Write an enzyme that holds these catalytic residues in place. Sequence first.
Site, mmCIF file in Angstrom:
data_model
loop_
_atom_site.group_PDB
_atom_site.id
_atom_site.type_symbol
_atom_site.label_atom_id
_atom_site.label_comp_id
_atom_site.label_asym_id
_atom_site.label_seq_id
_atom_site.Cartn_x
_atom_site.Cartn_y
_atom_site.Cartn_z
ATOM 1 N N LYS B 221 0.801 -1.223 0.000
ATOM 2 C CA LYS B 221 0.000 0.000 0.000
ATOM 3 C C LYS B 221 0.832 1.271 0.000
ATOM 4 O O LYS B 221 0.806 2.035 -0.965
ATOM 5 C CB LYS B 221 -1.012 -0.004 1.164
ATOM 6 C CG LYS B 221 -1.995 1.162 1.129
ATOM 7 C CD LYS B 221 -3.269 0.914 1.903
ATOM 8 C CE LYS B 221 -4.323 1.900 1.434
ATOM 9 N NZ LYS B 221 -5.465 2.066 2.380
ATOM 10 N N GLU B 227 9.066 -5.217 5.494
ATOM 11 C CA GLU B 227 9.040 -6.603 5.038
ATOM 12 C C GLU B 227 9.054 -6.742 3.521
ATOM 13 O O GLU B 227 9.955 -7.358 2.954
ATOM 14 C CB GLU B 227 7.806 -7.316 5.596
ATOM 15 C CG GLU B 227 7.938 -7.785 7.042
ATOM 16 C CD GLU B 227 7.453 -6.810 8.084
ATOM 17 O OE1 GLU B 227 7.623 -5.583 7.940
ATOM 18 O OE2 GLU B 227 6.873 -7.294 9.074
ATOM 19 N N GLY B 287 -6.019 -2.309 3.418
ATOM 20 C CA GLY B 287 -5.192 -3.465 3.075
ATOM 21 C C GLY B 287 -5.910 -4.804 3.168
ATOM 22 O O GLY B 287 -5.872 -5.604 2.233
ATOM 23 N N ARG B 288 -6.628 -5.013 4.267
ATOM 24 C CA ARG B 288 -7.382 -6.249 4.503
ATOM 25 C C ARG B 288 -8.677 -6.355 3.690
ATOM 26 O O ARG B 288 -9.418 -7.334 3.804
ATOM 27 C CB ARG B 288 -7.676 -6.393 5.993
ATOM 28 C CG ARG B 288 -8.146 -5.138 6.671
ATOM 29 C CD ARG B 288 -8.266 -5.280 8.163
ATOM 30 N NE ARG B 288 -8.825 -4.067 8.766
ATOM 31 C CZ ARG B 288 -8.109 -3.028 9.200
ATOM 32 N NH1 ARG B 288 -6.791 -3.025 9.115
ATOM 33 N NH2 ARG B 288 -8.724 -1.984 9.733
ATOM 34 N N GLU B 373 -7.866 -7.427 12.767
ATOM 35 C CA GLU B 373 -7.197 -6.149 12.537
ATOM 36 C C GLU B 373 -8.223 -5.020 12.385
ATOM 37 O O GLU B 373 -7.930 -3.854 12.664
ATOM 38 C CB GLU B 373 -6.245 -6.200 11.340
ATOM 39 C CG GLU B 373 -5.151 -5.147 11.398
ATOM 40 C CD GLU B 373 -4.331 -5.064 10.141
ATOM 41 O OE1 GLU B 373 -4.897 -4.732 9.080
ATOM 42 O OE2 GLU B 373 -3.115 -5.317 10.222
ATOM 43 N N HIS B 404 -9.944 -33.634 13.815
ATOM 44 C CA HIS B 404 -8.902 -34.475 14.374
ATOM 45 C C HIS B 404 -7.829 -33.620 15.001
ATOM 46 O O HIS B 404 -6.735 -34.102 15.305
ATOM 47 C CB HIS B 404 -8.308 -35.327 13.265
ATOM 48 C CG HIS B 404 -9.316 -36.136 12.536
ATOM 49 N ND1 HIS B 404 -9.510 -37.470 12.810
ATOM 50 C CD2 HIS B 404 -10.168 -35.818 11.536
ATOM 51 C CE1 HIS B 404 -10.436 -37.937 11.998
ATOM 52 N NE2 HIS B 404 -10.856 -36.960 11.219
ATOM 53 N N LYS B 533 6.315 -1.538 15.234
ATOM 54 C CA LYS B 533 7.148 -1.046 14.135
ATOM 55 C C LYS B 533 8.207 -0.070 14.638
ATOM 56 O O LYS B 533 9.382 -0.196 14.287
ATOM 57 C CB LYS B 533 6.295 -0.356 13.065
ATOM 58 C CG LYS B 533 5.439 -1.293 12.237
ATOM 59 C CD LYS B 533 4.732 -0.525 11.134
ATOM 60 C CE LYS B 533 3.787 -1.416 10.357
ATOM 61 N NZ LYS B 533 3.021 -0.640 9.348
#
Lengths: 568, 568
Positions: B221, B227, B287-288, B373, B404, B533
């Site tokens: 963005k 990262e 973003g999400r 978020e 399981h 951050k």
Amino acid sequence: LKGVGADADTTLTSCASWTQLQKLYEQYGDEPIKKHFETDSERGQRYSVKVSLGSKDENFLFLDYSKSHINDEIKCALLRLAEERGIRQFVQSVFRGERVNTTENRPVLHIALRNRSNRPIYVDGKDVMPAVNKVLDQMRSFSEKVRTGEWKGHTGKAIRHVVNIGIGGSDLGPVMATEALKPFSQRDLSLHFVSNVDGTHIAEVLKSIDIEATLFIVASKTFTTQETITNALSARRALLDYLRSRGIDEKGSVAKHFVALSTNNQKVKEFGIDEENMFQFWDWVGGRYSMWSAIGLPIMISIGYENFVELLTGAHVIDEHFANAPPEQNVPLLLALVGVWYINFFGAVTHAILPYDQYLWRLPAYLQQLDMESNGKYVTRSGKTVSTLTGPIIFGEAGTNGQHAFYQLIHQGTNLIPCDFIGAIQSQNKIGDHHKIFMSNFFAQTEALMIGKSPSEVRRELEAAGERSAEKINALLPHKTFIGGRPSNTLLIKSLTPRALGAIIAMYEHKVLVQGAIWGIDSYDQWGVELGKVLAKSILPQLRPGMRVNNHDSSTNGLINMFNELSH
Amino acid sequence: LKGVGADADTTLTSCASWTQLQKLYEQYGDEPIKKHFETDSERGQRYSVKVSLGSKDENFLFLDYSKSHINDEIKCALLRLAEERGIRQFVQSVFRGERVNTTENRPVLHIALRNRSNRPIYVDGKDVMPAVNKVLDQMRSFSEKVRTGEWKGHTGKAIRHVVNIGIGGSDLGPVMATEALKPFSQRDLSLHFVSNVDGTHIAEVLKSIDIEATLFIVASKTFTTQETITNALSARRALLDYLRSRGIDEKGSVAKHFVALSTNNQKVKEFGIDEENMFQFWDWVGGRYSMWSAIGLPIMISIGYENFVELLTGAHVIDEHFANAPPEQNVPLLLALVGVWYINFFGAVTHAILPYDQYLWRLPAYLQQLDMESNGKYVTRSGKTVSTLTGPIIFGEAGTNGQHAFYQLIHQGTNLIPCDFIGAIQSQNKIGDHHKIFMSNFFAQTEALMIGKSPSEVRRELEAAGERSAEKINALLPHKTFIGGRPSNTLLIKSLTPRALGAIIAMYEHKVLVQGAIWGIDSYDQWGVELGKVLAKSILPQLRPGMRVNNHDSSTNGLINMFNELSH
């Protein structure tokens, strides 16, 4: 839980140490974590234990549980709870082979699978060690044949694809460990994991493989698990279908492409697999504690025998540490007590596993089974209803992806979420400055969760930049404020070697043991999966085109009817 | 939350409808779910809504929320809460472009990205639709060039590998959707996702690709995300390193192998990417909530333009349904109100996303970001501290693996866990009887969670087999008892088509919207990721060999010091 209709358990709530911990919660629970650091300058050391893994590379498993609402009084009191509930005695009972899995009257000896000391452990008056070592040797011999290219397929091709067919305990371990130990793997052997009975899982694997060069590993404890058998039947059908399409004689093909990992010998023989290709494991090996047994064959085929032995030895080192180290310096006991403190007193029903290692991306899913299927019980061994909260909801993603996913909630949500930050000092991949950038987040996030950022700090920082607007400051102030006091445990290892992974899983297995024993539950049974199986078995013959049902509740009826109306 | 230091919010707790819901909880909360089915034979229909997706295949999104502690009084009251909190008005405000993201003063228009009707939506008095459509066309043109083999690498090779470099919002969507829509994908294009700054992520992708035939998609963005930039710099270094090792001229290589998905034009130009290879998205695209924008380029390269348009149209159909359907028949509103009922009145802090579709295996991780978020906030838009619980912890694994793994806890744990069971009537893979076996578990698990198994039923069943032992019956009885009354929502679709996936995500986006608006929080900002951050940025220059620090708390100090002692 009055619907369980058993009397409430008082053995835990009546403990002098439990009453004391409740008193200490009411007294010190509101005290921020930073206060404990301001009052004790040595907190980082005093509330941390380094356990050597006994290897030449000087690897260790370091637990830092200092970022917690635990002062010396609370710590002493949690250790008192461990002493009153007879954890030391229970650990000895688990390790020496006693029938601690009371509801099924079975021993709990996953520790025997990794018992490198070969100290005799008896089940029914017979040392299980020669049998454990026999399978490990059979696994060695077979894995070497697959790895060197000696094991051929029906058309004479060396194995290039290793497809593990199994679900849950016969999947999560194999997936987690092969993913975790990928830099120690033989790259020319592509590992595939078919677990879901969703046709998609087998179908996508069939598209990704050269069936002629594929070894199918059918992994199942009882060898009756509907998922594993349906997938294995389709994997067999696929093998036979390929050979028939090429006009090749299928005789003896199954014996070259299929092997089994089970406790049940007859269901393996009924499937069409040779006895010498059956890797034995026992009833005392719980599914979620089976990656160390025969179930670990795909891990051994991937990483090799020597690396699998390292995996076992790491677990063994932590087993020895757990059973012999003093209470105040015992890593899994402390990890468990920190958990009990948060679950039962703070009421924190969730626990985040945040491994800062991309190879450990399937670790949270593995620990979900290990913790949740073990400790998600509401009845004690004595048949009484628990009067305390038991197993928490485990979740998490490998960092740093979790940061950009749900850390917002851990930092600024309305829930207290105890976190386990696991990281390696040395990466297996020396890529630029990636590891220091990566690890800056590792130490920062735990620090962040702990210290937070008060309104005063936020106001100052804004006044520090070019902010003249009291409106902007006042508006942004609460949104930018971090209450802090969010707990975390930091698990730091020198590097993620097979020994290190073994050490980490064993620690969690033992954490689960202590928590289960404190709660008085059977951390080794799984009666909770039975109703879903029974109801699925009853719904299966009803899932036919156009079939209408009325024997269930209106929701299930309407859902099955809708399915049947538009299925085929 | 007194550490936030803002006054407590009373706007929600003082609502007549909230006080009423608290009263109805005290009255009907202890009433088992089965009671509502016994009293209302039409509950399955009355508490379920089918939304057509408007496609030729007659696909739908069916929500069955009947397996809940909700009677007609509670339902009417939850809808009253929605009316008092002004959800209808808030939805219109979000859709029409208003600055509903108050803390950043930004519009929230992810709905504009999928606005197929091309109804004018204004931001700053300008219709955003031509700009949305321009990028969709640019995405179409470029994706077709990659798919047909027209887009060549520096050595003239067609693209065989598509590597998406991005984290969180620029990762989870691309991962989830390409995984979800794999049977609609172009198989000769291998999709890779580099997100983690752990060197391992880039390193493993570099081992799996033919760099000459690889398109690197840098998605971010702000295009400043540490990262994504570190990984992108290493991906560029890798390209240049390959060409230098082969002695090939590197001029103009980056422009053929690298493209960007950003809002920031200058950081893209500074990186060395051509402007025509920059796919634009806006600040109003969270973003999400970005998989529908330029961020969706790797999805479009995988599935094609037509299938991406179907993905958008599914979302559009649910957007129209959400904004226009009556309250009592509105799927995302009902899903949100069921959630509010459980989170705020039952105190259920967790929510399980259990998709019974292997392709949807990355859906829970996606929804973790989308929900956590967005709604993991403790401060309202007005700057006041919330007086209610907000966003829950989202977790889950694709079924049947979860069965399981952790269903034992959902069935027999001490926590009430609201579950979302999502499934398809028709599989994309017609493999034997796999789908009916698969779906038997789907309907069974929800039925199981609801009905349970009382002590009487267990005693009868044991007496039904060959059990003569009252000791064995009495001992096993509480362990085999299922209290039931565990809630679940069933989301049933005809098939998982791109349109269906679009419909599912939009529903969850809108569920999150309503929940966020009921709580009065800003579901569109993420101030909670900033401290981590800032503290990482401060720890980064301290991570050098042998460097010792003392500016942090003793834990962080000891951890950084230990790292520096054994790092290089």
